[model samples]
Target: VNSFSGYLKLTDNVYIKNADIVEEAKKVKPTVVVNAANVYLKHGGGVAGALNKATNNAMQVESDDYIATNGPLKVGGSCVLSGHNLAKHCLHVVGPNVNKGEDIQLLKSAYENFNQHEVLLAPLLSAGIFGADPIHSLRVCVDTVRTNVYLAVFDKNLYDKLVSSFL
Candidate 1:
């Protein structure tokens, strides 16, 4: 397991890491992996985009029409998607919103609402495209999700920054 300074267990199950999410997902075999989506539910960039490509856009086809009808998902809101290729299910949270408080709350809601297995993988929601603070975003996710949560870190620079913050 990866470790760092001041890494307290925010919850009994939550964890943070600096690693490749997809590879880590394969290793952990979580029941579901999360995708950070825009209100339109489009898988256009970042982790969502990568997952969309990885699944051959299977996720998009399965979800687009339904999401169009039901969404765009408001911040702090989510929907479950059925598909193949990474996990049994993918939880898409409509995040990356401009409002930081709502985005963080919605991320927490997304995590809390996932009623599947004990394990799940996610990125720091809104930290990338939406410009939210990674550490604060991650802390919210860890505090709220009621399962074994693995937070994937893609940037070494950000990871080091987080580490420094922790110390």
Candidate 2:
């Protein structure tokens, strides 16, 4: 059903991809997509930036609305936002910032919210901008998000390393 040929099936309906996340999100057209966001919904960089750019900046408006209502998001928690150019809905999560190593559990918690979606797309939360270990982040993603999971990884070396480590 899922079009990800290279993705490793972690479990029933859950998969991991070492390819571009944005491309997979488009290909899957999942019901829900995960955005590794900040508390204020500043969709400015990393995957957030890419998603915002793809959606023509609609995510920024949605982020503004989220902040106005929820004040500040708690770390390890998440909120749903409108997916303008990608999935039908976007799960905005408050993941760790750069070098916030101890919050790996928090990052893992964010992925847990994807249980409702039959097909879900996500990136290595905190692994890019936040500098978390790729293996650790992917572990958290595959372990927590029990539904259909699709992850994106850009670097070939890192991707191969992860594949060897997990599969």
Candidate 3:
């Protein structure tokens, strides 16, 4: 209903949006929303910061408590944290640091855990600040999230690619 909204349906129950991820994710009740987290799971920037801000910082507290108990996630590792406001649960995952020469396979690790959710919302992991190519990240999201999924793209260029690429 606003600037943070627009989607292209790929199939029944599956789509892509040029929108704010947290806001679009809220459209599907109790969905598992993905946060592109650092290994430390800090709610610092990109997806993590966005989700934390939307949830009134509760998700950050949950992340802090989880890491305190189970330790920080390894590269490509993941852990679930409780959501606030609109989301059901948050999947906090560590994407590979491409600058560190980390393996790209790690990106797929986050997608592996996407099953079991009726609705899954995510950005292209590692594509932002982490520096992976958008196309590669998009492919990972597509091959991995098969249904009831929405991949949010904020950039106009990327949105064009996603829309035209699919069309």
Candidate 4:
């Protein structure tokens, strides 16, 4: 909402609009709402300037444990994984240390089976610079896992071949 609202301009071709962020939030009717603004400031180890601009005090979800809950069996600990609560279940896959192969496995597993449930909602995925290498990263993510997996990627470009294979 407000956090995502700002200004983006490119020379002369520009337009703008204002709307209720909360009302916009209602449109998604998210069962599990996630705030990824923290991911924008996950570094610098500072008390000010480096943290999220939206808040000053540390929130419960800001704990290191939740933001980086991923390991071999714990992907949630390391990555932000997705955005604003479309996912019925959330999996946070932080990388650099975690193997790319395992993450792919999980994604594929969800894709094959995500539609089976009646109350299923959209899945969300996010990857920063680390995700720029999504071709290989996503391969590892979805290859081992089952299907019905919907990946919301940080970079949509790398999925050309992989997406075709999946489809």
Top of the candidates by TM-score = 2
Give the per-residue lDDT of model 2 (tens digit) for 1-167: 65557777666655666776677677767778888887778888788888888888888987888788779888777888777768889988776765654456677677766776766777777877868888888777777876777777777888778888884
**Clash count, predicted structure 4:** 32
- Residue range with the least summed lDDT across 10 consecutive positions in model 4: 8-17
lDDT of 1: 0.69
Ranking by TM-score: 2, 3, 1, 4
| Total backbone collisions for each predicted model | 1, 0, 0, 32
**Per-residue lDDT tens digits of candidate 1, residues 1-167?**
43222333444776666776666655655667888776677888788888788788888887788776775776666778863677777888765465544535555665565545466677877777767788877676656767677677789888777656752
Query: What TM value does model 3 have?
Result: 0.85
RMSD of each: 4.2, 2.1, 3.4, 11.2
lDDT of 4 by residue, 75-155 (tens): 332233332333323222223322243353333433223333222122122234323244554444444333222233222
TM-score of each: 0.79, 0.87, 0.85, 0.35
Q: Top model by lDDT, which number?
A: 2
Candidates in order have lDDT scores of 0.69, 0.76, 0.75, 0.31
Return whichever of 2 and 4 wins on lDDT. Answer: 2
Write the number of the candidate with greater TM-score, choosing between 1 and 2.
2
Q: Scored by Cα lDDT, where does model 3 land?
A: 0.75
lDDT-better candidate, 1 vs 4: 1
